[PDB]
Short mmCIF file of N, CA, C and O and ligand atoms in Angstrom, two decimals:
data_model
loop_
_atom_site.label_atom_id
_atom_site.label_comp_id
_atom_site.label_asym_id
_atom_site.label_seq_id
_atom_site.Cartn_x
_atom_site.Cartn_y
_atom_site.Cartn_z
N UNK A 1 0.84 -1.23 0.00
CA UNK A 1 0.00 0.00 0.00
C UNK A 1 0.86 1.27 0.00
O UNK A 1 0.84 2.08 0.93
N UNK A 2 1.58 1.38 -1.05
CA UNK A 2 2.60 2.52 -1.22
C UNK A 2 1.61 3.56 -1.23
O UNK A 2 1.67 4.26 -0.22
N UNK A 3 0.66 3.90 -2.11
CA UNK A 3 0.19 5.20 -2.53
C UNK A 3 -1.69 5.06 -2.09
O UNK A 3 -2.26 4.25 -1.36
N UNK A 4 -2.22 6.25 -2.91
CA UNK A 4 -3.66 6.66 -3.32
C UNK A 4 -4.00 6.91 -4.38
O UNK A 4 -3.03 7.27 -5.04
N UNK A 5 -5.34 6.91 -5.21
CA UNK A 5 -5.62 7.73 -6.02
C UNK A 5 -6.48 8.86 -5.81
O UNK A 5 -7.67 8.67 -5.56
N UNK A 6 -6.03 9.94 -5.89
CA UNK A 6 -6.42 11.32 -5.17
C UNK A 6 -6.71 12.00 -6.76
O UNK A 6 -6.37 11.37 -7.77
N UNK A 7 -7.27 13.11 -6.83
CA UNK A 7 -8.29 13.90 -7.70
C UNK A 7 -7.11 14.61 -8.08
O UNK A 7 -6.87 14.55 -9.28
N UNK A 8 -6.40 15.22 -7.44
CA UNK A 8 -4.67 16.03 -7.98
C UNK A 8 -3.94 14.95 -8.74
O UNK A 8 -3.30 15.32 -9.73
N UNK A 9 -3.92 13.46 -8.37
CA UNK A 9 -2.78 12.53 -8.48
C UNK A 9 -3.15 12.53 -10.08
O UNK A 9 -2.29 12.49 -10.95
N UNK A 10 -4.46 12.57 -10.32
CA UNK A 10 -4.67 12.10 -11.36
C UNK A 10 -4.59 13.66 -12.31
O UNK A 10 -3.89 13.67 -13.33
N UNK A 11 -4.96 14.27 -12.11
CA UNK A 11 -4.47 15.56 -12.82
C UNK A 11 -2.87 15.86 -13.20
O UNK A 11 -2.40 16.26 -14.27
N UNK A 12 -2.32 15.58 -12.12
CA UNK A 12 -0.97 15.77 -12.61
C UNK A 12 -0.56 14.34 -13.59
O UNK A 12 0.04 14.48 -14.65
N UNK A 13 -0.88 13.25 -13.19
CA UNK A 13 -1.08 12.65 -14.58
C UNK A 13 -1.61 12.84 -16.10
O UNK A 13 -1.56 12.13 -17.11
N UNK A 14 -1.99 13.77 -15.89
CA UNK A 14 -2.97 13.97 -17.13
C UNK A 14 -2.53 15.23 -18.06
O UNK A 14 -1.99 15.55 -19.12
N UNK A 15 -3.01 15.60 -17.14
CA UNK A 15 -2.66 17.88 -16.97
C UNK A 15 -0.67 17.87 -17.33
O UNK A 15 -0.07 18.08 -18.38
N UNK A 16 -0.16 17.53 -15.96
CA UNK A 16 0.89 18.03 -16.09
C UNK A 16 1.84 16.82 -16.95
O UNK A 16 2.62 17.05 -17.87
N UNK A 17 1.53 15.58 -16.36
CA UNK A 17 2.37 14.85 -17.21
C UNK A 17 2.59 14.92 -18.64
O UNK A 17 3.58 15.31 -19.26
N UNK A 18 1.28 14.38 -19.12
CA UNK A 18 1.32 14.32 -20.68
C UNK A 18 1.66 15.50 -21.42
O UNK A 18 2.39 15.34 -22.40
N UNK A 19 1.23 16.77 -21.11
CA UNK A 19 2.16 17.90 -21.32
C UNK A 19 3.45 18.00 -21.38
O UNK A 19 3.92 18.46 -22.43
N UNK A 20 4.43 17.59 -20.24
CA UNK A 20 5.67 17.96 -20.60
C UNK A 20 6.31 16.59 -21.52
O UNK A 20 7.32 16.71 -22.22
N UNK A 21 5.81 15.76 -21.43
CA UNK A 21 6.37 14.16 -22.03
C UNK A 21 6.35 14.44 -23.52
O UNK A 21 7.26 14.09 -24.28
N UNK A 22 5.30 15.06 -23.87
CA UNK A 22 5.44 15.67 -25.29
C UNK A 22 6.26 16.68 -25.55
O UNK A 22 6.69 16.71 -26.71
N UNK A 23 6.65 17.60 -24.76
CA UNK A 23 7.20 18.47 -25.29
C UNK A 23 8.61 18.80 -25.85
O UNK A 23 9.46 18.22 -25.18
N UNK A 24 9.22 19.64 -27.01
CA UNK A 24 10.21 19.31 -27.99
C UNK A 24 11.54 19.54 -26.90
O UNK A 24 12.66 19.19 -27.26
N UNK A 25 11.37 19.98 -25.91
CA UNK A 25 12.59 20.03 -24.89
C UNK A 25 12.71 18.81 -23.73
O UNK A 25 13.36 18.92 -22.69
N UNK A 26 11.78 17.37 -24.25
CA UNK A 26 11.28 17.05 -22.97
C UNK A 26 12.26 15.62 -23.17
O UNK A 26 12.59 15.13 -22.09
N UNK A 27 12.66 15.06 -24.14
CA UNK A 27 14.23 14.14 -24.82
C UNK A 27 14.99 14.13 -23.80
O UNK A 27 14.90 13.00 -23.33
N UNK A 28 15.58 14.64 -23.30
CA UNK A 28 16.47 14.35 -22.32
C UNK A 28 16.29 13.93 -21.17
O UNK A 28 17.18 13.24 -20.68
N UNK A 29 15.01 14.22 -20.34
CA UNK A 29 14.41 13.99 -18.95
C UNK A 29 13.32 12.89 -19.24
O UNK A 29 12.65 12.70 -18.21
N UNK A 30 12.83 11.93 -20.50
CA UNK A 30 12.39 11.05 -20.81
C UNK A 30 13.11 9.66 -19.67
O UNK A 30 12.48 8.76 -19.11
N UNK A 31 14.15 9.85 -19.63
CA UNK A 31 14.88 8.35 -18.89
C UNK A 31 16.06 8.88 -17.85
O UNK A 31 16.28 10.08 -17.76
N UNK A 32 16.83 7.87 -17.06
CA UNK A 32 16.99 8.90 -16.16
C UNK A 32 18.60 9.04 -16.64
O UNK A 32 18.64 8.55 -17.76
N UNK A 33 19.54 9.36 -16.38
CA UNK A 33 20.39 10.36 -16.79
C UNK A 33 21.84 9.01 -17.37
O UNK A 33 22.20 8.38 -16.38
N UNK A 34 22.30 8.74 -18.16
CA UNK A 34 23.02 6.94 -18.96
C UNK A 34 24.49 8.22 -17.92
O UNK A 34 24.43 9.44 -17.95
N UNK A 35 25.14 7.74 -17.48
CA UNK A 35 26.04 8.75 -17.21
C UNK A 35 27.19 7.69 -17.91
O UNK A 35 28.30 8.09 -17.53
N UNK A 36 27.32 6.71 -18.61
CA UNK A 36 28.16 5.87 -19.52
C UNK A 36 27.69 6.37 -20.68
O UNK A 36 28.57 6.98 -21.28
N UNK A 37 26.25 6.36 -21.47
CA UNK A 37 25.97 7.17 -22.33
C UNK A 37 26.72 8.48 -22.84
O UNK A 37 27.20 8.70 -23.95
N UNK A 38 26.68 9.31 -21.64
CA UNK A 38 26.82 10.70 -21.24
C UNK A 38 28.96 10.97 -21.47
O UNK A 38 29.70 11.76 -22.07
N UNK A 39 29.09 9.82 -20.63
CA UNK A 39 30.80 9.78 -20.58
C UNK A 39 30.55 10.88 -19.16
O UNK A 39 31.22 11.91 -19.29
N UNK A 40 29.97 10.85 -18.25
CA UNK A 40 29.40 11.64 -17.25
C UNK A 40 30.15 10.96 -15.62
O UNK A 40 29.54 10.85 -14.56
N UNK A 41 31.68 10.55 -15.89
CA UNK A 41 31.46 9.83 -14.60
C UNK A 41 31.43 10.13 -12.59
O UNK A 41 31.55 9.43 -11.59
N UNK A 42 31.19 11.70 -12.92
CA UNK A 42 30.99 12.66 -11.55
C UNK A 42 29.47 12.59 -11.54
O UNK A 42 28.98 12.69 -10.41
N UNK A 43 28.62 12.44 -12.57
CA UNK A 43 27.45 12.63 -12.19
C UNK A 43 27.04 12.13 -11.07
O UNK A 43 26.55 12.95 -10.29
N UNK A 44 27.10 10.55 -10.61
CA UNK A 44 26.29 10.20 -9.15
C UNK A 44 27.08 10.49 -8.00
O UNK A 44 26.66 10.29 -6.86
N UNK A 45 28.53 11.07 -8.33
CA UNK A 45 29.35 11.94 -7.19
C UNK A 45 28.84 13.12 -6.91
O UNK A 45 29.33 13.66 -5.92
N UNK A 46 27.95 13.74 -7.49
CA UNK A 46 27.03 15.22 -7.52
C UNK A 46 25.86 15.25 -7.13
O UNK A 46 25.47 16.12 -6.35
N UNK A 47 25.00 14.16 -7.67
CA UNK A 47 23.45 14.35 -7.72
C UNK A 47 23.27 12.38 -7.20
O UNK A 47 23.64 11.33 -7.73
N UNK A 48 22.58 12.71 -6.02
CA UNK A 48 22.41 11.53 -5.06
C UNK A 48 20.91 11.22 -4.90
O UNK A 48 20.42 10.39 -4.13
N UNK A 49 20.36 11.91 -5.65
CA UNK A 49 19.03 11.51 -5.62
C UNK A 49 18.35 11.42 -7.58
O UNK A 49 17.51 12.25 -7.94
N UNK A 50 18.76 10.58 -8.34
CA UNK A 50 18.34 11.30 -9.67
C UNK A 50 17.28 10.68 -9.87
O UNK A 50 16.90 9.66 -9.27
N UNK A 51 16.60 11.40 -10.93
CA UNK A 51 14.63 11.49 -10.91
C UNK A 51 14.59 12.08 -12.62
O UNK A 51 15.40 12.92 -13.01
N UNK A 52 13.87 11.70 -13.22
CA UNK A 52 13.43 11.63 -14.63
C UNK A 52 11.91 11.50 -14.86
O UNK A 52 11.23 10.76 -14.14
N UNK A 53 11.37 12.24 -15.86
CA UNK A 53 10.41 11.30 -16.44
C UNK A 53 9.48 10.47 -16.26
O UNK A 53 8.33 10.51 -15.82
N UNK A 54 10.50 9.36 -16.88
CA UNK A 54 10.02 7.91 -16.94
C UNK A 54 9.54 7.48 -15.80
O UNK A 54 8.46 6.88 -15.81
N UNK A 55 10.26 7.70 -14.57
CA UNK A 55 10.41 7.28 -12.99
C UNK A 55 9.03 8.02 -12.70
O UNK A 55 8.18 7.27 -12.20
N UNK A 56 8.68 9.20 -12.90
CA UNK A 56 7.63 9.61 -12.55
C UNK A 56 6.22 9.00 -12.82
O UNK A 56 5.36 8.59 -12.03
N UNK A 57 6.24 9.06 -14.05
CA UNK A 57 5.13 8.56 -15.09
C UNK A 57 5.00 6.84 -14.28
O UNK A 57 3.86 6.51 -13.95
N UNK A 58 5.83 6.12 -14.09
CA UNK A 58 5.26 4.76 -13.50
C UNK A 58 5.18 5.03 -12.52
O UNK A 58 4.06 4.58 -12.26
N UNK A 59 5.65 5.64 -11.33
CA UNK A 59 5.43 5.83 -10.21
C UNK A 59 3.69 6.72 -9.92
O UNK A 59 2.92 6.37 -9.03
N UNK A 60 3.45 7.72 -10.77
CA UNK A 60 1.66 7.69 -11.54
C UNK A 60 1.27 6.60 -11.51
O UNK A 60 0.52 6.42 -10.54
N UNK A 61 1.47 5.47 -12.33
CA UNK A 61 0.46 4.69 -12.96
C UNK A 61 0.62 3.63 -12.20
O UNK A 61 -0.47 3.05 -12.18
N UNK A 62 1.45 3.03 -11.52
CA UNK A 62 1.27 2.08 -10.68
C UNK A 62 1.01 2.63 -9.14
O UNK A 62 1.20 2.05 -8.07
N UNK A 63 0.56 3.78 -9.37
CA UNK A 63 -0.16 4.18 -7.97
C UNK A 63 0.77 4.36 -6.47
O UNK A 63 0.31 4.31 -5.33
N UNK A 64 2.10 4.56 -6.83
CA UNK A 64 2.81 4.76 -5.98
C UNK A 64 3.04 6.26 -4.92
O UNK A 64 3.80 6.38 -3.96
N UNK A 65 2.45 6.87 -5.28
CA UNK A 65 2.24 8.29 -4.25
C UNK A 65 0.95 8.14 -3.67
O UNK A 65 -0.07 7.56 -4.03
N UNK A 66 1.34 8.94 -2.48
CA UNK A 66 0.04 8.88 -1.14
C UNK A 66 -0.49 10.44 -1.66
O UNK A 66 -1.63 10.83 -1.40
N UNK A 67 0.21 11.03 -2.21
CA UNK A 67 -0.36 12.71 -2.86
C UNK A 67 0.54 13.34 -3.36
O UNK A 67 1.77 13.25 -3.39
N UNK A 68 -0.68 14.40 -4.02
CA UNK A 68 0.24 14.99 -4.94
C UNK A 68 1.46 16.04 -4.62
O UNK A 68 2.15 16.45 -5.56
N UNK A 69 1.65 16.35 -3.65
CA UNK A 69 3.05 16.88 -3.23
C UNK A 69 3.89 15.84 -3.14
O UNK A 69 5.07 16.11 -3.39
N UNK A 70 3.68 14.82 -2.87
CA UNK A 70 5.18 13.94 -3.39
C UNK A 70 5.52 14.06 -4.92
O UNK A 70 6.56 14.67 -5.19
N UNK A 71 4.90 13.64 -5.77
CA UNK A 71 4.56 14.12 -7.12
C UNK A 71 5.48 15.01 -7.73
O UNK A 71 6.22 14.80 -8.69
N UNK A 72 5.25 16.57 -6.69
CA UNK A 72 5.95 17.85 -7.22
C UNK A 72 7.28 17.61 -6.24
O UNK A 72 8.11 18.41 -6.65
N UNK A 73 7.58 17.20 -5.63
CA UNK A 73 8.54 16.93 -5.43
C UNK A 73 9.46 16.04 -5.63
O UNK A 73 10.32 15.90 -4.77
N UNK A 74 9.49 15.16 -6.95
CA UNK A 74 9.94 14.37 -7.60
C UNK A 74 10.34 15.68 -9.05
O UNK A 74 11.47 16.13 -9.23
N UNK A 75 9.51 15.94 -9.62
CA UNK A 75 9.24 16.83 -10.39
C UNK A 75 10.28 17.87 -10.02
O UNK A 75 11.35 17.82 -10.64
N UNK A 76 10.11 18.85 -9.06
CA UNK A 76 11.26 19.71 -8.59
C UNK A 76 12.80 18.62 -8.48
O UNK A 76 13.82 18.98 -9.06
N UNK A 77 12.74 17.58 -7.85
CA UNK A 77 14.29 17.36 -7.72
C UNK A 77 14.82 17.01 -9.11
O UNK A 77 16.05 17.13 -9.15
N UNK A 78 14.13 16.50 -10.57
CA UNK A 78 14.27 16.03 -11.51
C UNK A 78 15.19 17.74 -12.16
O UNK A 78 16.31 17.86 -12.65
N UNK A 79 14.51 18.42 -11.98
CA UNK A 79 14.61 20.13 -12.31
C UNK A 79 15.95 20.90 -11.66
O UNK A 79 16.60 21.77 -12.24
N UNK A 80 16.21 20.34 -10.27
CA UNK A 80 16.87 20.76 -9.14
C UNK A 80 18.27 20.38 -9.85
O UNK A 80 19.32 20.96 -10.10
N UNK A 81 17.68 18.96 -10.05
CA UNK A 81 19.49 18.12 -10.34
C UNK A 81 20.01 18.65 -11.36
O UNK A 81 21.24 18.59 -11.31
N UNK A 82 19.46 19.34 -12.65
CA UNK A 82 20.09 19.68 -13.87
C UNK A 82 20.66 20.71 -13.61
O UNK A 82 21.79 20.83 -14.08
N UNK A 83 19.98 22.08 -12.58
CA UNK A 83 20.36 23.47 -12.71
C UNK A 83 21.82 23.23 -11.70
O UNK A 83 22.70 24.06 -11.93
N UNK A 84 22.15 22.13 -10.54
CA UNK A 84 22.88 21.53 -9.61
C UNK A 84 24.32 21.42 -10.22
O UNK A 84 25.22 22.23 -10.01
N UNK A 85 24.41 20.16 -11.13
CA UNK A 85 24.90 19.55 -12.24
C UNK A 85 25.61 20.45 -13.03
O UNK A 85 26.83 20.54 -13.07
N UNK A 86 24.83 21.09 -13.65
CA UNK A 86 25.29 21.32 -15.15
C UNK A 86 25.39 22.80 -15.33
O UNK A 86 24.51 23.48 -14.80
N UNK A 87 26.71 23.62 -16.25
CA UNK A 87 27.12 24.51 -16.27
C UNK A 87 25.97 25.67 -16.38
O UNK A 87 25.12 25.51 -17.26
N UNK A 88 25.93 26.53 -15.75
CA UNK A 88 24.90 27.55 -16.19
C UNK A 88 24.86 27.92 -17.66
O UNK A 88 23.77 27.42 -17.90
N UNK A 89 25.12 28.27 -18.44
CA UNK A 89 25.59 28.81 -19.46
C UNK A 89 25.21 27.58 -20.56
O UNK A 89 25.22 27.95 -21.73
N UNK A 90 24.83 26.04 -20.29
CA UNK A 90 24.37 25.04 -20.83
C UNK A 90 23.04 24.93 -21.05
O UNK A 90 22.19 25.43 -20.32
N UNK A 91 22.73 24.09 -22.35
CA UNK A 91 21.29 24.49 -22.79
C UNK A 91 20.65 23.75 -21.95
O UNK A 91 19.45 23.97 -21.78
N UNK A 92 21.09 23.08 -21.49
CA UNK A 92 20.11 21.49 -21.48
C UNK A 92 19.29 22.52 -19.96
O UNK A 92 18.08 22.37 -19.74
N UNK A 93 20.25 23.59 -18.98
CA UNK A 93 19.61 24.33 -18.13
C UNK A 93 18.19 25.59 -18.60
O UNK A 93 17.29 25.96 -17.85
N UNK A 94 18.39 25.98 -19.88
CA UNK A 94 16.89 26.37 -20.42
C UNK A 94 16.27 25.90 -20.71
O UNK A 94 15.11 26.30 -20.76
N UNK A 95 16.80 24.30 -21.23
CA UNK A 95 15.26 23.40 -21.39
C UNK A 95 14.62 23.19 -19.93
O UNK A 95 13.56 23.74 -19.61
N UNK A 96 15.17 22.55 -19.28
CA UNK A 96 14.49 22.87 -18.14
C UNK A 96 13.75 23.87 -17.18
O UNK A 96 12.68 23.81 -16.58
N UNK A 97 14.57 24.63 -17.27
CA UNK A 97 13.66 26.32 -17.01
C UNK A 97 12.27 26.26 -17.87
O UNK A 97 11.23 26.54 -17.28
N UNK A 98 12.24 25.92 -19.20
CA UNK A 98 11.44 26.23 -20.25
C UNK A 98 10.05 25.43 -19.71
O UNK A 98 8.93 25.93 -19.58
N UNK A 99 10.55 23.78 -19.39
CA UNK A 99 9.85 22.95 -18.88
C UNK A 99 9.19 22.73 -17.50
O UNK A 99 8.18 22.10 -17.17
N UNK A 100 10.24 23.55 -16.69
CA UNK A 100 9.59 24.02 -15.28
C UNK A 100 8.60 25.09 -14.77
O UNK A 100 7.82 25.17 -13.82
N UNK A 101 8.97 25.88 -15.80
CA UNK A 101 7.65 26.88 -16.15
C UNK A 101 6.46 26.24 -16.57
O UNK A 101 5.55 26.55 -15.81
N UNK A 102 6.20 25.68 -17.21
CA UNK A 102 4.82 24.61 -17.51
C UNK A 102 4.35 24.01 -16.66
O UNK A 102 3.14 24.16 -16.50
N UNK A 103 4.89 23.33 -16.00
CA UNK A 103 4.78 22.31 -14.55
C UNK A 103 4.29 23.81 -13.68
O UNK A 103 3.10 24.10 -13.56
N UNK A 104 4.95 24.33 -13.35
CA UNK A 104 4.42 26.03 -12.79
C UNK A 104 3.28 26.26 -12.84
O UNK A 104 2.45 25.93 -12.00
N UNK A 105 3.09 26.89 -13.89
CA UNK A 105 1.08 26.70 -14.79
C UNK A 105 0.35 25.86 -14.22
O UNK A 105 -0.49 26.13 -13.36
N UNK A 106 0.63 24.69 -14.68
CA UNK A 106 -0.41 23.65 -14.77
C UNK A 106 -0.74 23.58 -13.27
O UNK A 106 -1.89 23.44 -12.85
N UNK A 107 0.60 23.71 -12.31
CA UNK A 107 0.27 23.40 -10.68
C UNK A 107 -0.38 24.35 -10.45
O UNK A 107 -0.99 23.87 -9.50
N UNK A 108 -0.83 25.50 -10.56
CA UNK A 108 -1.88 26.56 -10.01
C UNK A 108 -2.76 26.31 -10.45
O UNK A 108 -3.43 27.31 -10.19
N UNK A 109 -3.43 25.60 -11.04
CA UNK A 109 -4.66 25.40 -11.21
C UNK A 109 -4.88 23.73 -11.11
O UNK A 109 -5.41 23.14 -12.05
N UNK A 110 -4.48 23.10 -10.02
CA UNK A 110 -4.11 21.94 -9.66
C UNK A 110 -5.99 22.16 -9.13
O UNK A 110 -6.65 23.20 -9.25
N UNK A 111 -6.48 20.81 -8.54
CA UNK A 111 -7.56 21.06 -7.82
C UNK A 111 -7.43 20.81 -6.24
O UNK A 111 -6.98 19.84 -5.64
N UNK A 112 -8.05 22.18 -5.70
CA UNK A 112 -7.46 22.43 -4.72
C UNK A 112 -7.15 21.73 -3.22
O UNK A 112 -6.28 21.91 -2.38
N UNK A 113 -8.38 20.78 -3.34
CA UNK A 113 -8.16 20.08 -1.86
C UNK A 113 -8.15 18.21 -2.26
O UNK A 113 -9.03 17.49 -2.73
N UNK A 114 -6.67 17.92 -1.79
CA UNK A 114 -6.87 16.40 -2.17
C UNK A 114 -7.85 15.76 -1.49
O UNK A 114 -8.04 15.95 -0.29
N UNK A 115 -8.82 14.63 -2.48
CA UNK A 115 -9.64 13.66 -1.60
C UNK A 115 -9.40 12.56 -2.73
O UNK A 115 -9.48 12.71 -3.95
N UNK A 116 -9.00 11.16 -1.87
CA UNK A 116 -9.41 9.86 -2.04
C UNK A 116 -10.16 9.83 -3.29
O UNK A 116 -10.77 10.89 -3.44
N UNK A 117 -10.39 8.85 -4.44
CA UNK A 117 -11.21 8.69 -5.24
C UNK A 117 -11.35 7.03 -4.78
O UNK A 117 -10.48 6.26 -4.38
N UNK A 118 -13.02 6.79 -5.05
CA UNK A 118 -13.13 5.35 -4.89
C UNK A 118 -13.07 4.73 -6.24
O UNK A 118 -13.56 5.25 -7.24
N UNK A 119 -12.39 3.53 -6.22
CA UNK A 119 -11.90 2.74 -7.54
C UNK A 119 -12.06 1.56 -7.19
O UNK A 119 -11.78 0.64 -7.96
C1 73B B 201 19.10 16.16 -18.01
C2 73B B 201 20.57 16.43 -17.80
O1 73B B 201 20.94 17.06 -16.82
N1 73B B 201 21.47 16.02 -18.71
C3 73B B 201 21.22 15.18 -19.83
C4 73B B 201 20.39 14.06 -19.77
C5 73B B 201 20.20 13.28 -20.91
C6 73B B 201 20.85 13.60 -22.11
C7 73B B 201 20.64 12.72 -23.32
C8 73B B 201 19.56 11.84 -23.40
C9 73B B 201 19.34 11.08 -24.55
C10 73B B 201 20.21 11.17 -25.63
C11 73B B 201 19.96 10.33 -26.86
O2 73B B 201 19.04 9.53 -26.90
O3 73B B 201 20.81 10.51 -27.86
C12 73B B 201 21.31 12.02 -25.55
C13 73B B 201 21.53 12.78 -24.40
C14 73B B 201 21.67 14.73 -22.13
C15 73B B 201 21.87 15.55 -21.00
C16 73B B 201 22.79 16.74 -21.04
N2 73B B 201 23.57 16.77 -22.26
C17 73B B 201 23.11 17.28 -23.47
C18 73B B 201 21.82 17.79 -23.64
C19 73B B 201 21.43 18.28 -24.89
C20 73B B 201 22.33 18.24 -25.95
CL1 73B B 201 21.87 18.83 -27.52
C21 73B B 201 23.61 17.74 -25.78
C22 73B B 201 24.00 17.26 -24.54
C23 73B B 201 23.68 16.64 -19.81
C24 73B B 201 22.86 16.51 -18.51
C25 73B B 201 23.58 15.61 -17.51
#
């Protein structure tokens, strides 16, 4: 009994997820970070918690959050680790900005009080 399905949980599934998963900056934060891919080998000497995407989206669908502030806080550390990481002056830090702004949006008009859904 890891999680719930709550009326936010499923919005940010919907609302915020599928939004950024599509979007043309959203390639890189799809899976979580190949740091052999990358030739990256300080990355898990830096960033001790890494979060993507993908990790999110099943952690949605197999119902693993108790609410939706865990959610945004997967979401923020996914965001956290790139600006952390990676040179300011690097793009891959405006895609994210670009993409954290959306997630932004969509969370203010989240619905406002979590309740339980029966399923
Ligand atoms: C998110 C993050 O902080 N980083 C990250 C993560 C994944 C990938 C990446 C993912 C997939 C491919 C691919 O499928 O070819 C290539 C690179 C790349 C990066 C970033 N590198 C990068 C991004 C865009 C471009 Cl055009 C060139 C290099 C580095 C960073 C660790």
């Amino acid at each position: 009994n890891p999680g719930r399905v709550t009326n936010q949980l499923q919005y940010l599934h919907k609302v915020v997820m599928k939004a950024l998963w599509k979007h043309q900056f959203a390639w890189p934060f799809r899976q979580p970070v190949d740091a052999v891919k990358l030739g990256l080998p300080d990355y898990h000497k830096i960033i001790k918690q890494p979060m993507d995407m993908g990790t999110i989206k099943r952690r949605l669908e197999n119902n693993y959050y108790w609410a939706a502030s865990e959610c945004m806080q997967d979401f923020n550390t996914m965001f956290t680790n790139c600006y952390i990481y990676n040179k300011p002056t690097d793009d891959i830090v405006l895609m994210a900005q670009t993409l954290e702004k959306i997630f932004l949006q969509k969370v203010a008009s989240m619905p406002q009080e979590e309740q339980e859904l029966v399923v």
